[PDB]
Amino acid sequence: MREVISIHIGQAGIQVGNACWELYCLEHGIQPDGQMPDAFNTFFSETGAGKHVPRCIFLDLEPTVVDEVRTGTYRQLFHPEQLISGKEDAANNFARGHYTIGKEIVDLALDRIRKLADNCTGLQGFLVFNAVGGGTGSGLGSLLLERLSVDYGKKSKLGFTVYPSPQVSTAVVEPYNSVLSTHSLLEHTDVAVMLDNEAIYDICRRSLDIERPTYTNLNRLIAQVISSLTASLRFDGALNVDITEFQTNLVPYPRIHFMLSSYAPIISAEKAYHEQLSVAEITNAAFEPASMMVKCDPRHGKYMACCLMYRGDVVPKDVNASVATIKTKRTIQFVDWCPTGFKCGINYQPPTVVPGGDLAKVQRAVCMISNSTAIGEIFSRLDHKFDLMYAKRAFVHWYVGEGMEEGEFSEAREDLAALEKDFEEVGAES
Amino acid sequence: MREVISIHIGQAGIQVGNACWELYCLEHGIQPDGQMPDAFNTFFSETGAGKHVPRCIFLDLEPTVVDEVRTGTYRQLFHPEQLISGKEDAANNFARGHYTIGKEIVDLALDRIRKLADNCTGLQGFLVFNAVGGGTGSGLGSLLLERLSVDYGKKSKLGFTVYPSPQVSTAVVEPYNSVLSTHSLLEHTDVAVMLDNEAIYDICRRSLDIERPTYTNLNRLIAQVISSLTASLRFDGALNVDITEFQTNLVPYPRIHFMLSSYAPIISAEKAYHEQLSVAEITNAAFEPASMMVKCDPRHGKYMACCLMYRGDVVPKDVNASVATIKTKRTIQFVDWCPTGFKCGINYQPPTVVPGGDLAKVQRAVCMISNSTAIGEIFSRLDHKFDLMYAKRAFVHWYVGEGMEEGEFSEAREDLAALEKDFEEVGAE
Amino acid sequence: GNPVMPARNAPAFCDEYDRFNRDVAGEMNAKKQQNLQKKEEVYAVKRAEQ
Amino acid sequence: IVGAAVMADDKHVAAASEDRTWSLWDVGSERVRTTWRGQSMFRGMAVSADKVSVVTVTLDRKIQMWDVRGPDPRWTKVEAHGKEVGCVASDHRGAAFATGGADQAVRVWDWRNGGEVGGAACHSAPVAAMAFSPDDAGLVSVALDGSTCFWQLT
Amino acid sequence: MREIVHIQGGQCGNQIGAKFWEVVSDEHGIDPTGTYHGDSDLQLERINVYFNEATGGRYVPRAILMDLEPGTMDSVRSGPYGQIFRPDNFVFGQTGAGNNWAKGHYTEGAELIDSVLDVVRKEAESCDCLQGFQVCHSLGGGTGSGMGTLLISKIREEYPDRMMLTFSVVPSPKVSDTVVEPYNATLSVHQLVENADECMVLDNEALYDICFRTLKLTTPTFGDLNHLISAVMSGITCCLRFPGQLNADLRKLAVNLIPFPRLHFFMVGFTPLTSRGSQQYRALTVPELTQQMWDAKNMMCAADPRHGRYLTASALFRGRMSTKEVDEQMLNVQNKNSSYFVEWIPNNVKSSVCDIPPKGLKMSATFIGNSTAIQEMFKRVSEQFTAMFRRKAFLHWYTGEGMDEMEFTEAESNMNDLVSEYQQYQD
Amino acid sequence: MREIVHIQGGQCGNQIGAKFWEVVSDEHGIDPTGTYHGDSDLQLERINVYFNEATGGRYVPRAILMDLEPGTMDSVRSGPYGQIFRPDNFVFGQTGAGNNWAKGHYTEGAELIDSVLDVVRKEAESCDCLQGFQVCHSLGGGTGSGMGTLLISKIREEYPDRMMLTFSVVPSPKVSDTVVEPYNATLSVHQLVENADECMVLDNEALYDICFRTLKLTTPTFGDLNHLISAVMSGITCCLRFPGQLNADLRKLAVNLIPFPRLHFFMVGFTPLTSRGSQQYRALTVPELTQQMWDAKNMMCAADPRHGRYLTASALFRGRMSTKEVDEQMLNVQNKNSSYFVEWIPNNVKSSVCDIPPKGLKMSATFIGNSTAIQEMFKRVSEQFTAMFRRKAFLHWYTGEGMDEMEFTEAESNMNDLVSEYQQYQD
Numbered sequence A: 001m002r003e004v005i006s007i008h009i010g011q012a013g014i015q016v017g018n019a020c021w022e023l024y025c026l027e028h029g030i031q032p033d034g035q036m037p038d039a040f041n042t043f044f045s046e047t048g049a050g051k052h053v054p055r056c057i058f059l060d061l062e063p064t065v066v067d068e069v070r071t072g073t074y075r076q077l078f079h080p081e082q083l084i085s086g087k088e089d090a091a092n093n094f095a096r097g098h099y100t101i102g103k104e105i106v107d108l109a110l111d112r113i114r115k116l117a118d119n120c121t122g123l124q125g126f127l128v129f130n131a132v133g134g135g136t137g138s139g140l141g142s143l144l145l146e147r148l149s150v151d152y153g154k155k156s157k158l159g160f161t162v163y164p165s166p167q168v169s170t171a172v173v174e175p176y177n178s179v180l181s182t183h184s185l186l187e188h189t190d191v192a193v194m195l196d197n198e199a200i201y202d203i204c205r206r207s208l209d210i211e212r213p214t215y216t217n218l219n220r221l222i223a224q225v226i227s228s229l230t231a232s233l234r235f236d237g238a239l240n241v242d243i244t245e246f247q248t249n250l251v252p253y254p255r256i257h258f259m260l261s262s263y264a265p266i267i268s269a270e271k272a273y274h275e276q277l278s279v280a281e282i283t284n285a286a287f288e289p290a291s292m293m294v295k296c297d298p299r300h301g302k303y304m305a306c307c308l309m310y311r312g313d314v315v316p317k318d319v320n321a322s323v324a325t326i327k328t329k330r331t332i333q334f335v336d337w338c339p340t341g342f343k344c345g346i347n348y349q350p351p352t353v354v355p356g357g358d359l360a361k362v363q364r365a366v367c368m369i370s371n372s373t374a375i376g377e378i379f380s381r382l383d384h385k386f387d388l389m390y391a392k393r394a395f396v397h398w399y400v401g402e403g404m405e406e407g408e409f410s411e412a413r414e415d416l417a418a419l420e421k422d423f424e425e426v427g428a429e430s
Numbered sequence B: 001m002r003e004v005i006s007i008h009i010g011q012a013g014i015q016v017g018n019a020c021w022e023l024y025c026l027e028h029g030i031q032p033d034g035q036m037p038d039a040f041n042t043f044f045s046e047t048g049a050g051k052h053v054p055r056c057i058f059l060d061l062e063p064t065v066v067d068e069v070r071t072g073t074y075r076q077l078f079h080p081e082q083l084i085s086g087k088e089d090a091a092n093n094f095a096r097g098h099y100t101i102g103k104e105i106v107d108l109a110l111d112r113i114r115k116l117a118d119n120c121t122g123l124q125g126f127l128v129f130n131a132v133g134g135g136t137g138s139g140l141g142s143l144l145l146e147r148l149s150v151d152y153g154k155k156s157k158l159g160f161t162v163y164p165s166p167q168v169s170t171a172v173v174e175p176y177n178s179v180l181s182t183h184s185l186l187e188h189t190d191v192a193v194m195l196d197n198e199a200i201y202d203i204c205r206r207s208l209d210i211e212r213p214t215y216t217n218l219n220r221l222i223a224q225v226i227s228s229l230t231a232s233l234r235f236d237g238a239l240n241v242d243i244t245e246f247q248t249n250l251v252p253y254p255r256i257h258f259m260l261s262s263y264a265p266i267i268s269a270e271k272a273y274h275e276q277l278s279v280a281e282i283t284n285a286a287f288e289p290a291s292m293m294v295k296c297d298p299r300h301g302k303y304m305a306c307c308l309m310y311r312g313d314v315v316p317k318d319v320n321a322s323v324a325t326i327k328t329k330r331t332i333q334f335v336d337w338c339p340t341g342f343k344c345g346i347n348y349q350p351p352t353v354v355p356g357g358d359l360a361k362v363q364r365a366v367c368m369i370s371n372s373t374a375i376g377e378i379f380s381r382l383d384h385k386f387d388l389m390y391a392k393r394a395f396v397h398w399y400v401g402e403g404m405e406e407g408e409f410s411e412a413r414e415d416l417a418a419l420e421k422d423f424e425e426v427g428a429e
Numbered sequence C: 001g002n003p004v005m006p007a008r009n010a011p012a013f014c015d016e017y018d019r020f021n022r023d024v025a026g027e028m029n030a031k032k033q034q035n036l037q038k039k040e041e042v043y044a045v046k047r048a049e050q
Numbered sequence D: 001i002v003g004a005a006v007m008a009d010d011k012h013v014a015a016a017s018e019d020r021t022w023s024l025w026d027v028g029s030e031r032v033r034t035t036w037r038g039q040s041m042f043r044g045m046a047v048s049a050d051k052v053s054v055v056t057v058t059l060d061r062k063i064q065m066w067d068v069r070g071p072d073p074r075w076t077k078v079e080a081h082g083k084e085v086g087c088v089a090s091d092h093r094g095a096a097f098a099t100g101g102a103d104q105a106v107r108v109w110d111w112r113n114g115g116e117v118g119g120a121a122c123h124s125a126p127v128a129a130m131a132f133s134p135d136d137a138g139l140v141s142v143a144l145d146g147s148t149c150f151w152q153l154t
Numbered sequence E, F: 001m002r003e004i005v006h007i008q009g010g011q012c013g014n015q016i017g018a019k020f021w022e023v024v025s026d027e028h029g030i031d032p033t034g035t036y037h038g039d040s041d042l043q044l045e046r047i048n049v050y051f052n053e054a055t056g057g058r059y060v061p062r063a064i065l066m067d068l069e070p071g072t073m074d075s076v077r078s079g080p081y082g083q084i085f086r087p088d089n090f091v092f093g094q095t096g097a098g099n100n101w102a103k104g105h106y107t108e109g110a111e112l113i114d115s116v117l118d119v120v121r122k123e124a125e126s127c128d129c130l131q132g133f134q135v136c137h138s139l140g141g142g143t144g145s146g147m148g149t150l151l152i153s154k155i156r157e158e159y160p161d162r163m164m165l166t167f168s169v170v171p172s173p174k175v176s177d178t179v180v181e182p183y184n185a186t187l188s189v190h191q192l193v194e195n196a197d198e199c200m201v202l203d204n205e206a207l208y209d210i211c212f213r214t215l216k217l218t219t220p221t222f223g224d225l226n227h228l229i230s231a232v233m234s235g236i237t238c239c240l241r242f243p244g245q246l247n248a249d250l251r252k253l254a255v256n257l258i259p260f261p262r263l264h265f266f267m268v269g270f271t272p273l274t275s276r277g278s279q280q281y282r283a284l285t286v287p288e289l290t291q292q293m294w295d296a297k298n299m300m301c302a303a304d305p306r307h308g309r310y311l312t313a314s315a316l317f318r319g320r321m322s323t324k325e326v327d328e329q330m331l332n333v334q335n336k337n338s339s340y341f342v343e344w345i346p347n348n349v350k351s352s353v354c355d356i357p358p359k360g361l362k363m364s365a366t367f368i369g370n371s372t373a374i375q376e377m378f379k380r381v382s383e384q385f386t387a388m389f390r391r392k393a394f395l396h397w398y399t400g401e402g403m404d405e406m407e408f409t410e411a412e413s414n415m416n417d418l419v420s421e422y423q424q425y426q427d
């Protein structure tokens, strides 16, 4: 038996997790009450008779995002002790999320993880949803990932983290909390998938023709990527791919574990009537720089390793023809020490559309999770924003008086500085 | 989306503005209360639900015409702070409207323009309405047009100015206010369309048989000219002509942006039954000098370029057949450096008839706006009136004492003198 | 009266039932579908006229 | 929980509470069939003759009649905007419907479409109960104070 | 479960909270008697932030009304919405301050602060997880200035880990109600920079200009000006009381606004202000709330924000709106005029969306600005104070209460250090 | 299987394209909904040349419609057969060229030329093997001329081995729709010579000659001219979509009509243009097609074929015909007037016989002819250009967009290069 535990940290994680478990109930036919009128084992635990409870913990220090789940349409689904709340929020402070108000809740979080790990027979990994821009997402996410590394060795932890965009952001101390979070997600997270809000807003405005995108329309397609990642855990396929198998192909080196994500057939309902969605056609659109889920231009760097997740009516022949044409394309480029680059996965289940949603009903889909050397300019831009703020010592007095020392910023930037140079060193030809 | 912002300056600006917005409420069906019981987007901006408000500002230093709009038949149409009023008028003084009292009220004008530019998505031009014979039109019209060049760069501005007549005019200091205005609108207005009150007086007597016309009768058929030249954006047609298209097809040189105007069918109700208003007849009627909106003789000069805007049931064959006959006539003369000199725009919307007006319901209409070298006789006649003014310094203490230096009289004098030389050299073969 | 409170006939006003509804994505989806249907109707009318 | 009623068969129950929720449950297998949600807390429910409608009145001065399949309120009516709307019950023939409010009023509506038939106002205090006689002769509708009201159906 | 303990200071504070508690009671659906006549369940979920559950469904505020003259207490109690307040919370003096900052701080403040601090302790210990104490008071008088700021002092050593959201109206250049306004303002700022956590600065002269220009109401009273500050005091704590797409309580706001511990004076503003003649012609959209948000005339301080660079800023958006329109409009205001924004901080603007708008509105927003332009209003009060002090004017009324002239010299010292430290971040 | 990618530019190209896609989908049996309603099996055999099969059996045309004026693509949605097109290919601008070649080619067209190449690359890679790119646009305009020739320059550089078909309409001799036609026409034809594999010249006042003299239409609608254009464009691609006795694609026409690389400007005409009054009196026979085909009034260019000798020619015959009797008409027309045919090319005429006639018509033909008489309508435009440019009039609206006066002398000299090489073959 195969199971995963999906942990969600902070305001971003719960609202993603609200959209994730909304779509997971539709895939397995579970009503929001928790009763279905063996594919459900990886996410839901068959409890007693006729009750399905998700395998998740919803921890946040601010009550306001958690009691919305406790009151809304999915209140009967979640076990009451699974949703963890606190009295006061971290308030955009990494030190508060790590030292002062994060220590009285990290102990109770591991207790729920231990009882969830005891329930599942074959635990396959961990899915962490957080935002490094905030205090609870970055700070308490750092403490939980640190404790899960010591407590659960060798187990997979998958970082689906939300990252500050270049031009669009909604907080002032996002450079501080994100650099401090990068000192933690290196040594603990096994494979980390970057997510950027503004790239989804580029997708939502253009691909879906939604002139006013919001976080709800943002999260519905982010929930599709993580659902497409776990598709072979729940349904059969021609080429099954497992959670521990992505790690054997997508991270060439232990310190290079940042992944760019992409979803191919993101077409609205009215556009879907005319467009013919062939396997080769969506594979071409999966590698488009506009269709990336992070604000990067992957033409800048070279691809180290790529993995593809095909769902629906996909014969294993047209995937092999599609990867041949995308390999020969000049505007894309692979690094010279990885001659083969692709991992192909096929799942027989067509993608499921949420009711009242935005994505159209399609027969095929691609989810590309790729490692590239264009992720170096993510960290270089944040290093410029951190150094421009840390030079004149801005907002430091909030972090210093809440547990930290002054030099912790110097350790985190120097750690990120090594993360800047090794992307260029690996991506350089020999 | 295509949109314009029509700014109206002065007593002539509001009175033409009150008449043209009455016309614009008739094509789109907008009620005086403001409720319609996608073509209206270029004039009326949809705010909330059920309400359409005009994209205009009404700025005037004299509050006796602005409150007439605020108490007349269109109280509920206009957004109240769009209508900008002042404490007291400029008093026929360019210096007062430019230096003394025009400085405080122009700040509120650019504030409301900033709201209108941000609200609409895609601008296409600013329409101005002013009378350069008065203090507010000359003075405040100048200062507003100075500001629009430095705030919104490279955007098209459309000039529709009521210009002083040779024979009959209502002002004494009208040579002074006109000369100082042309020094500022030469390098600012991208398109300038002159309008002359005695030319429109002559149109109403003959074509409309109104023996006693007023300003209300003159502003109605002026409003038809502005409505026709913007009718292509509002209503679909075979040959769309844009606001940005007008600059690219009428001005050969950046300092030559003065164009005449003529609206072809000007027929009363009784005369409509006996006249077969064919496309060849109205096109021939547009080039006739007594149908021109400016008291000028285009037979004296030569046309540099022409524009034709057609409304109603016009097929494209007989507009091409009608301009074929025009180019063959020797009475009309073309410059040798412009062999093809027409721009033709065809729409499918017949012109709307105002209630109580004098223009009858018609099927086909033409609006001819053309650049010509005969326009240089308009400025040369007002050259002589200003030189007779400034020779012994009459009415100068009202100007010098109210801010401005007397050296700007000669600076604007020399600028229009160079404009006289410029029109006479472009017409040379 | 009340300064910041509108006067029952303004675009700014909400009912007490309306001000407590929270479905932003749902309302924008409904507006998008209604706008597309209205655009189809406008295109059909223009086609008939032509 | 405010309102509750047995179905046409003895095997199924229906309920309506203040959690903005109402439901239809199975007596034998004590588990939910389906759950209907609302946007305001309920204040009463009634069930028509043979499954055709379940009606609930809320705190926000509105009457919502529901069909058991197709989860959407079939018909919602805002009414009695002076004060709150208190209690309802059903005619046994399924042709009439009582409504009580925190006003001095009692109202009679129809199940197919809301059409006001009942009288203006007799009782003093806000309502508390309803439930027409089993022959549609009359209706005992009672106020919050020590007042009962006997009505004859026109 | 983060509550707020409200403190009312003096004549201005009692009236500004007489209308503030009227707004949030009608926002939460509480009738003047105190019962719950609200129509939906989002109100009941967060009542604990401001009110208390009582017997019989009553909801009483955590308001501690305190002053030195009982005449203001009789006006608020006998007026409408005056029965909601607890009668034992109506602590008051008898002598009165008499515009004397020394009297309100030293002589008759001594025997009343011990009475009002017990009400603070009773209110603060009963509730569970304090967020902070909100106080509304004046800097021009002596009842709410000398005694109000000393309440901030004695509450600070007792509860140092909690927030302090102080609202202060300041004396005006144009119109002066009292003569000793420069003396009372500068002596209260000295006690405010060291003790208060964050300060929201209000002023009467901007509120008259806002009501005259934007609202077109040619003769404002104290009623409509008080309701404007009440419409903003609700907006700061809007995300505590209601869920949202991106929540932001008080400590979210402090960390994203002040980069340094002493730069904690702000300027505030309310977005959807319109005249009654202009209500039917204005449409509520995020592009036009944003342009009225950043307008200089819309702000509620005398300092023109065009003069000084915005060090940091924050936005408290309320209603059903898309976060991309919140993000794009606040990005657009950074790039079109980047000369008005400080250069050593990227993305100066904080944004947060609350899903519940105020009563009778589609969308609303509240702006908080940490600008260096506010040095000109501290400077202008300072030059008012220096002109009086060099001639020993009105000082015998102050030295008679044991307050020596030595402390006046050091009160101007950090007054000038506040405008010195705000100036050197502008360059 | 030999796919043609159609690309339309400006108001003219979309209006030409709207009538083109009506005519082709009618003879293929494709309804405005998107389904197939034909009565013969020959229509579905070769349908991928113009229509992409989609989900549900719908056929979507392989068309990319572009313009810088967004209201014009509302006119093609409003036109009949307007819902067959994919909404993704409707790439739109916001500003509008306004009869400026420079605005469409450098300043305003560059921001849209990335997305047009984005959909052209997507559309070309979808099909198996390209046969060419077909463009219909204007030369007197600003979008069809400026943005069109930039696109033709871009797709020739990227795809060099694929054919090019430009049904470019050229400014008229007699009456002109706009004043600045020679500025746009000369700059467009400079970019057409080294990019277009073959160009097909149309004139509007040559089309009016057809509608008046031959069709006896008293008031020709502007869409009736596009009916004649769509009749020819459907005839060029006749042998690809339908079987025949002698097949000839666009490449076989290029290799026969183009002796030297720069002489790729043709003039064309559709043969069986008869009025309804004279419909019953004319025998629809092959000799009646041939001599009417070679008549000067049929040809849709202002240049008269009688003035200069024919260099090459092409005939595309459709319907039930005899190969000998088609060919003997081509030998007869080369001998009865041998002065109008060049001497050093024997057999100046190519002929192809297609077996599937147009729908509702028994037998048709299409002419393509490379002549040295086509220089008459390029020297005329050069006569218009040399008049305007010598006095540097109407030039500030071109030099304000980045180009200088030296680029005008590039197009002026290259226009005079083409009329020089055409003239020396007339001798």
Ligand SMILES: Nc1nc2c(ncn2[C@@H]2O[C@H](COP(=O)(O)OP(=O)(O)OP(=O)(O)O)[C@@H](O)[C@H]2O)c(=O)[nH]1
Binding pocket: A009, A010, A011, A012, A013, A015, A016, A061, A062, A089, A090, A091, A092, A093, A131, A132, A133, A134, A135, A136, A137, A138, A162, A163, A164, A169, A170, A171, A195, A197, A215, A216, A218, A219, E245, E246, E252
């Ligand atoms: N992708 C995505 N990101 C979100 C969403 N909501 C918030 N975020 C991100 O989260 C950041 C805000 O910081 P958070 O970590 O969410 O704040 P928090 O979780 O409440 O932590 P504290 O504020 O310290 O209590 C923003 O910069 C957003 O980028 C969401 O719905 N989807």
Ligand SMILES: Nc1nc2c(ncn2[C@@H]2O[C@H](COP(=O)(O)OP(=O)(O)OP(=O)(O)O)[C@@H](O)[C@H]2O)c(=O)[nH]1
Binding pocket: B009, B010, B011, B012, B013, B015, B016, B061, B062, B089, B090, B091, B092, B093, B130, B131, B132, B133, B134, B135, B136, B137, B138, B162, B169, B170, B171, B197, B215, B216, B218, B219
């Ligand atoms: N055609 C037309 N001309 C008008 C109209 N109203 C005023 N004029 C012209 O304007 C001239 C008077 O000067 P104005 O510019 O109107 O004076 P003003 O706008 O009040 O500016 P001040 O006098 O400084 O206040 C007259 O000679 C008219 O020619 C009008 O309604 N129609």
Ligand SMILES: Nc1nc2c(ncn2[C@@H]2O[C@H](COP(=O)(O)OP(=O)(O)O)[C@@H](O)[C@H]2O)c(=O)[nH]1
Binding pocket: E009, E010, E011, E012, E013, E015, E016, E097, E099, E138, E140, E141, E142, E143, E144, E145, E169, E176, E177, E178, E204, E222, E225, E226
């Ligand atoms: N906005 C507002 N300001 C007030 C109000 N009452 C007094 N003020 C201001 O407070 C200043 C003087 O404060 P004062 O009344 O002496 O405070 P006191 O010491 O408590 O009596 C004056 O400048 C007034 O403008 C009010 O109800 N609203």
Ligand SMILES: Nc1nc2c(ncn2[C@@H]2O[C@H](COP(=O)(O)OP(=O)(O)O)[C@@H](O)[C@H]2O)c(=O)[nH]1
Binding pocket: F009, F010, F011, F012, F013, F015, F016, F067, F097, F098, F099, F138, F140, F141, F142, F143, F144, F145, F146, F169, F176, F177, F178, F204, F207, F222, F223, F225, F226
């Ligand atoms: N035959 C034909 N000519 C057209 C059509 N539409 C426009 N034209 C011609 O194209 C020229 C103007 O081109 P235009 O559409 O303005 O090009 P653009 O402005 O660059 O997009 C005019 O001379 C018209 O005669 C059409 O549907 N058919």
Ligand SMILES: [Mg+2]
Binding pocket: A011, A062, A089, A090, A091, A092, A136, E247
């Ligand atoms: Mg938080």
